[PDB]
Design a protein around this ligand. Sequence first.
Ligand SMILES: N#CC1(CS(=O)(=O)N2Cc3ccc(Cl)cc3[C@H](C(=O)Nc3cncc4ccccc34)C2)CCC1
Ligand SMILES: N#CC1(CS(=O)(=O)N2Cc3ccc(Cl)cc3[C@H](C(=O)Nc3cncc4ccccc34)C2)CCC1
Ligand SMILES: [Cl-]
Lengths: 297, 305
Amino acid sequence: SGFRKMAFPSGKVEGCMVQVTCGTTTLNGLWLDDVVYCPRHVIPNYEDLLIRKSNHNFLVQAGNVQLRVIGHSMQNCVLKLKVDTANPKTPKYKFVRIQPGQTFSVLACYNGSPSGVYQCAMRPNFTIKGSFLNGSCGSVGFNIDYDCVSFCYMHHMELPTGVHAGTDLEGNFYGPFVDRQTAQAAGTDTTITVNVLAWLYAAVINGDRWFLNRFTTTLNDFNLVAMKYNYEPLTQDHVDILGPLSAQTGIAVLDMCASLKELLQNGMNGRTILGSALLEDEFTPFDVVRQCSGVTF
Amino acid sequence: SGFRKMAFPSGKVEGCMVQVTCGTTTLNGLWLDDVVYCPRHVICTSEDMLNPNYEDLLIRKSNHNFLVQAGNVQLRVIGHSMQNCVLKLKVDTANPKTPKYKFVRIQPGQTFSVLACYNGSPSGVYQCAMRPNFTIKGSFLNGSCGSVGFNIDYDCVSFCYMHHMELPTGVHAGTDLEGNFYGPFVDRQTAQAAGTDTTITVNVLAWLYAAVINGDRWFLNRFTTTLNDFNLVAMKYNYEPLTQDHVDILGPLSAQTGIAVLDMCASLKELLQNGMNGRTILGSALLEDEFTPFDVVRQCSGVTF
Ligand SMILES: N#CC1(CS(=O)(=O)N2Cc3ccc(Cl)cc3[C@H](C(=O)Nc3cncc4ccccc34)C2)CCC1
Ligand SMILES: N#CC1(CS(=O)(=O)N2Cc3ccc(Cl)cc3[C@H](C(=O)Nc3cncc4ccccc34)C2)CCC1
Ligand SMILES: [Cl-]
């Protein structure tokens, strides 16, 4: 029993964190094989600013050991520093781009040293509600599938509302952001409907059934209601994805949708669901199945 | 900016997790130097659990009855001893991944990271707190026994908890790494229940200061309170008493924000009376009590917004 916001074990990623200094800027880098990946803003016309730089201008520190930079190149908003030593701690890995609604673990670092790990979701507005201070740039987001680390996020900046923006490991931003000090704001956000539904199934599995009702709804009627509360539309793919949890609890997805509709129109009436007075949307259907089954890495 | 429930990076602990099998029972062990630490109930059957005599059960075991697995490598057990509710298995190989460590016993209200494991394999990490009733609200399934709680301030791992059991309400009970249980609990399947739980007042206050540091002041008021009047009110909402030690501990956050502890106590009294009225504090519609004053100083900025 119990349902917590759970992150993946961070050990395979801790062994990849390094410090990258160039001039006055110090941030974090990801050392995989003989390449260190970091935000290109560590150096604006980025190609023009990069030609001036030489390999020795980039100081890379792995623990108390200085790494030698032997080459450098740019791929979108990420800088790739070729180093003379392959990371002996390089795990099995992939670079994957995630979609809004998907969750991942963040290993927050300062000066190449990991300080904390937390779980979060890519918001529908492409921002992440993280916890980062100055020096956290280059901190990474990841998932673990078997023994393979899938790197999905690299931290670049904070927006005026306190939310964060970044790129995949190929340097492509999540959202309409640019890596420069300019006027940019997060769009109006929405609630991840398929995730709230998954968390309602997690509550039923843990013995919290007060919100269940005898009613059902059509997918169209549910979406008409959900659009009025700034909830993301629920697709047939979302319904199919919730199939296993619907089979385990005996509550059809549209049956649970009628529960969600009543929760949106009436509130919780002084009651909580899994210790929360708000509807939680940062657990995917796979997160719920994994945590209520005990998958290891 | 931002405020998340943050766990310590788990890598130094992952390199210590092993699987311990005894007969039909399999659970997790903590391999530090040449010793594997695990719950002593690994020697029990489900029948034994009602009234187990661990000394009688242990004397019948030999070193080769304990199977210890570190990854895909079998460790050889060369000795065994019991210390309170923990079993210590002497192994023939020192863990080359043993970090710098300490065994610390924590007090209620203290927070720590839990690395939840099954079959000696880590599955997840989460942050939690020792409740005032000495239980923890964890996320544990069968096979998680032996999973550990820890803090990593500096590069030293301080082990503070080892998981032993789930009580009937779904909450969890366990020991420090010297085998002493937190609370009036026993490693027996006897009728035992967690005492009525209370809210960790000093932690809610710390989290209110974290909200002020992050730029939120809607809940503040023009009032102050005496410590005694605050406690008379707090007890009525099942909040733990606030002591002078708690007030002293909040001193640095009070100095950083410019809000006296007894003025922050007056905002809390008012929040308990009025609720949040559709508002949130740091993305939460409830008053959060699983961040200590030390967690807030570690996670938040040194400059108030
Ligand atoms: N807006 C804004 C702020 C950041 S900044 O103006 O100092 N800033 C401009 C900038 C422009 C482009 C790029 Cl790609 C990065 C960056 C940097 C960046 O965001 N860094 C950070 C990243 N994360 C968490 C931070 C917390 C605190 C301060 C920096 C933080 C630096 C001022 C309030 C937050
Ligand atoms: N009450 C109860 C339950 C546990 S048990 O009856 O299976 N059980 C009795 C027992 C008694 C004393 C001691 Cl020291 C250990 C133990 C064990 C124990 O708690 N294991 C576990 C530990 N953690 C999380 C679990 C979740 C699920 C099942 C086991 C879990 C075994 C049944 C619902 C939880
Ligand atoms: Cl303590």
